Design a binder for these strands. Structure first.
Ligand SMILES: [Zn+2]
Length: 54
DNA sequence: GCCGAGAGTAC
DNA sequence: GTACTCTCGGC
């Protein structure tokens, strides 16, 4: 239905207002270093809570 | 296989 | 006016 989020279209400016808002992030389980805090949550499901939630 | 980053929107 | 989430490609 809605178009997908493609970063291919022209006029793709890279403002720091998207990276500046996030601060470095470390994993308390395997000390993995994730830069974006949002990505840190994803790391939890990838190398830790990646098991069935049931 | 994981990682890193852009856009659209709400308050 | 900021940060939020969802997505896509790259090595
Ligand atoms: Zn970890």
């Amino acid at each position: 239905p809605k178009a997908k989020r493609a970063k291919h279209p022209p006029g793709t400016e890279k403002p720091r207002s998207r990276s500046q808002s996030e601060q470095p992030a470390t994993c308390p389980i395997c000390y993995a270093v994730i830069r974006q805090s949002r990505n840190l949550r994803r790391h939890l499901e990838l190398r830790h809570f990646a098991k069935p939630g049931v």
